[PDB]
Design an enzyme around this catalytic site. Structure first.
Site, PDB file in Angstrom:
ATOM      1  N   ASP A 160      -4.029  13.455 -25.679  1.00 48.14           N
ATOM      2  CA  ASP A 160      -4.133  12.043 -25.299  1.00 48.14           C
ATOM      3  C   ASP A 160      -3.446  11.215 -26.371  1.00 48.14           C
ATOM      4  OD1 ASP A 160      -4.680   9.462 -24.611  1.00 48.14           O
ATOM      5  OD2 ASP A 160      -6.922   9.789 -24.399  1.00 48.14           O
TER       6      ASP A 160
ATOM      7  N   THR B 245      -1.533   5.896 -22.228  1.00 44.03           N
ATOM      8  CA  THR B 245      -1.347   4.577 -21.735  1.00 44.03           C
ATOM      9  C   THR B 245       0.109   4.144 -21.934  1.00 44.03           C
ATOM     10  OG1 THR B 245      -2.106   3.605 -23.821  1.00 44.03           O
ATOM     11  CG2 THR B 245      -3.750   3.978 -22.094  1.00 44.03           C
TER      12      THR B 245
ATOM     13  N   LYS C  93       0.431   0.438 -25.441  1.00 39.66           N
ATOM     14  CA  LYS C  93       0.195   0.341 -26.942  1.00 39.66           C
ATOM     15  C   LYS C  93       1.556   0.425 -27.652  1.00 39.66           C
ATOM     16  CE  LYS C  93      -4.564   2.306 -26.417  1.00 39.66           C
ATOM     17  NZ  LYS C  93      -4.421   2.517 -25.005  1.00 39.66           N
TER      18      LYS C  93
ATOM     19  N   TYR D 233       0.888  -1.195   0.000  1.00 41.43           N
ATOM     20  CA  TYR D 233       0.000   0.000   0.000  1.00 41.43           C
ATOM     21  C   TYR D 233       0.912   1.226   0.000  1.00 41.43           C
ATOM     22  CZ  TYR D 233      -5.061  -0.140  -0.350  1.00 41.43           C
ATOM     23  OH  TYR D 233      -6.328  -0.231  -0.901  1.00 41.43           O
TER      24      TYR D 233
ATOM     25  N   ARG E 273       0.002  -2.638 -18.895  1.00 41.04           N
ATOM     26  CA  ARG E 273      -1.255  -1.878 -19.022  1.00 41.04           C
ATOM     27  C   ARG E 273      -1.348  -0.875 -17.870  1.00 41.04           C
ATOM     28  NH1 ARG E 273      -3.805  -4.822 -22.763  1.00 41.04           N
ATOM     29  NH2 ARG E 273      -5.402  -3.209 -22.624  1.00 41.04           N
TER      30      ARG E 273
ATOM     31  N   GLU F  65      -0.260   4.723  -0.955  1.00 38.83           N
ATOM     32  CA  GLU F  65      -0.938   6.017  -1.186  1.00 38.83           C
ATOM     33  C   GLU F  65      -0.003   7.202  -0.896  1.00 38.83           C
ATOM     34  OE1 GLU F  65      -4.553   5.949   1.156  1.00 38.83           O
ATOM     35  OE2 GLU F  65      -5.624   4.770  -0.460  1.00 38.83           O
TER      36      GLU F  65
END
Ligand SMILES: Cc1ncc(COP(=O)(O)O)c(CN[C@@H](CO)C(=O)O)c1O
Ligand SMILES: Cc1ncc(COP(=O)(O)O)c(CN[C@@H](CO)C(=O)O)c1O
Lengths: 418, 418
Positions: free
Chosen positions: A200, A226, A229, A54, A235, A56
């Site tokens: 984008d 992303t 690609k 974790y 991903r 954060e």
């Protein structure tokens, strides 16, 4: 004893289905334009114990103990992203492109605000104002498209729509646009109507990274992408900006604005993928991706097919299927039947619905990763042409299946694995 | 040649930092209540070629070719989730708990609508109406808390707040609540004011799955969870509902409403984790988790500490630090200094800010996974008590470090890996 041994022992059902998926990737032509084959190194990071943490917050500013090594890894990811894209700021935590885009919207907009992106049917993304996506459900989405004459952007027309519509945010960057995007002209247009400007670049990120497409970072307020690609990573998503104060605001919108804990194993994979893209080999790969796409588009044209815009500057193309009297849905099925994986896509000014379409979208990244060259992509074009021109012909069908098998045998995929 | 070999060869920097993180997990007491140690089998799925597949849509209803095996895997994940939680519907695609919750909000609410959850300072989550989260930025968030007398929920008072506030959505389920939640009473309260009812069981999902906590699924409109806390799976989210028509609406809100492509490698890991939780061993583990948390809470009480609510019914507890004149921030640091990983947390009615706090949150899941029993958790309580009672004492500090080392040596973590 390995993790895969434990999987086989404890879940033979999932183990077996995973083995089938590897066989499937090996034995099909993967022409989905948004797909790639990520490296063994990337997959090793995703399979790591980093899943257990974790974290954060941000490096050195976390809400949990024990993040010293996670901080080192995420900071490598950040630093390599800033190197690769020439960016003053990077956030490597977005779980996806959709989440990267949402965090930007949370920063710049309030519900009801007006956004302007490319028409979905012309190549714009769901997250750029589809009424089925939060971007069009909770914001007023207006669209520009391509010229019916050239089938590419007409920047004078885009300026005219911006002046008429007065959007708060203009979005450029697309899911199915095969030409170079002029980010300088988008900046001019945004400045003239007082809009924020997002690029984008999910689809073209590896081409940007390699210098084979102009870089939006110096010109736009913010750039999303992303990692999976043309960048050939795991991903996930990424937020870049030339403005480091704005970058701090985007950080707050990722966490705590829209996400909780980041996927630190995936972030390790992002670091690895960025490191691979910094190498000269990746520049060569990205050049080959475009040469291969152009070869496939040219050969399809030689076989009588219309390519939207008349060709491609990048990794993808849209095949207009009027010449063969098929819908995208039909063409997609027909190529699946011969072990070619693609997806249907509306063309600009498509007479059919988006659930039917008149187009097939094809891309070169995945099979370029397997080693194919331009003549191999000309052969792919011929197999697709043969199948679509003779959809009832069983002998053509089997010729296609055999020609696909030959390509897959010539260019093994992940040969160290079983 | 393995994927890890390729990582070492191509990115020694990331390889080395990953090895340090494994050492770190081995050599600390991991008491963060939301952490766990997922299985080798789960990690193998995350390290797989499933990362390479675009699979927007649902099994047998995808927007891309080539999903035959992905469909089989995601359908196993779905079916095992429906088995494990006794649910008519499950969506295994949410990238996180935050994204699962957002998809629910997109389905049931519009911006500006009123939501009612637990006060963040009393144990509610950021995504249940924090003004720094989209849930409080774009919705009107009202809160209930615990009784100042009992420090647990008072259902009559919750009904009074619901009647006064008239929320559209009531949320139950929390990040730091140590008692059993009565979902039947939440249903009564929701029915009385005409609100939707969401249970966010992220923290307690493995206890629900094992029958050691009441199941919200038959009573609530929808149940969200993460897969990585007490459920001991990969990091991700999950949407469950008793109402299969509503489930179809939640599916649309996940994709295309809020996400793009799902993480199919992670989804394979969810399937594996659900399969592990179906085993009798997992029931025993979950019982041990609660016994261990209770043992640690009881021993802390024996050492003069206040436990919020006077104990725990589940995997976690909040330690009130007045008895030792420390802030949560200070206590968190002091335990990090002796190789114990936790996090600070506000207590109910905390006099300090959330960036300071009066509390330390501790949980048993991770160290229970390593094999510790109740007497081992009593020893952990004694180490923490020693350190917090004598924060300036160097000899106590080193005793604590040595006692932590002994626990870690006794209970190896992933001993097959390096
Ligand atoms: C009830 C609930 N719902 C949702 C989430 C979000 O999960 P995510 O981190 O996967 O987004 C959390 C995370 N919980 C973290 C804090 O974010 C924790 O350490 O407690 C949660 O407790
Ligand atoms: C420009 C752009 N921005 C964002 C996204 C979303 O990425 P995600 O799938 O990681 O959410 C996509 C995905 N693109 C998928 C469709 O969703 C594709 O096959 O083209 C995209 O093309």
């Amino acid at each position: 004893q390995t993790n895969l041994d434990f999987l086989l022992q404890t879940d033979p059902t999932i183990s077996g289905m995973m083995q089938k998926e590897l066989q499937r990737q090996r034995e099909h032509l993967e022409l989905i334009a948004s797909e790639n084959f990520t490296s063994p190194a990337v997959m090793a990071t995703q399979g790591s114990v980093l899943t257990n943490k974790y974290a954060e917050g941000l490096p050195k500013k976390r809400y949990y103990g024990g993040c010293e090594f996670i901080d080192e890894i995420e900071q490598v990811a950040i630093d390599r992203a800033k190197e690769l894209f020439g960016a003053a700021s990077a956030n490597v935590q977005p779980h996806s492109g959709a989440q990267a885009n949402f965090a930007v919207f949370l920063t710049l907009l309030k519900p009801g605000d007006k956004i302007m992106g490319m028409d979905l049917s012309h190549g714009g993304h769901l997250t750029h104002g589809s009424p089925a996506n939060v971007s069009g459900k909770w914001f007023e989405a207006v669209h520009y498209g391509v010229s019916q004459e050239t089938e590419q952007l007409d920047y004078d027309h885009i300026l005219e729509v911006a002046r008429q519509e007065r959007p708060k945010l203009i979005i450029c960057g697309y899911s199915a646009y095969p030409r170079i995007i002029n980010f300088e002209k988008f900046r001019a247009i945004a400045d003239e109507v007082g809009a924020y400007l997002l690029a984008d670049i999910a689809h073209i990120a590896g081409l940007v990274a390699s210098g084979h497409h102009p870089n939006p970072v110096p010109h736009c307020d913010v750039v999303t992408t992303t990692t999976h690609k043309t960048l050939r990573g795991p991903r996930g998503g990424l937020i870049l900006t030339r403005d480091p104060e704005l970058g701090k605001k985007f950080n707050k919108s990722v966490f705590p604005g829209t996400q909780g804990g980041p996927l630190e194993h995936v972030i390790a994979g992002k670091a690895v993928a960025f490191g691979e893209a910094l190498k000269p080999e990746f520049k060569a790969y990205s050049g080959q991706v475009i040469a291969n796409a152009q070869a496939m588009a040219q050969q399809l044209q030689n076989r009588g097919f219309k390519i939207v815009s008349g060709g491609t500057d990048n990794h993808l193309m849209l095949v207009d299927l009027r010449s063969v009297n098929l819908t995208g849905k039909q063409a997609d099925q027909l190529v699946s039947d011969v072990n070619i994986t693609a997806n249907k896509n509306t063309v600009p000014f498509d007479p059919e619905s988006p659930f039917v379409t008149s187009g097939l979208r094809l891309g070169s990244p995945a099979m370029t990763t397997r080693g194919l060259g331009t003549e191999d992509f000309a052969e792919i074009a011929n197999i697709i042409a043969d199948r679509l021109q003779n959809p009832e012909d069983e002998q053509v069908k089997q010729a296609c299946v055999q020609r696909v098998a030959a390509l897959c045998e010539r260019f093994p995929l992940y040969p160290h694995l079983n």
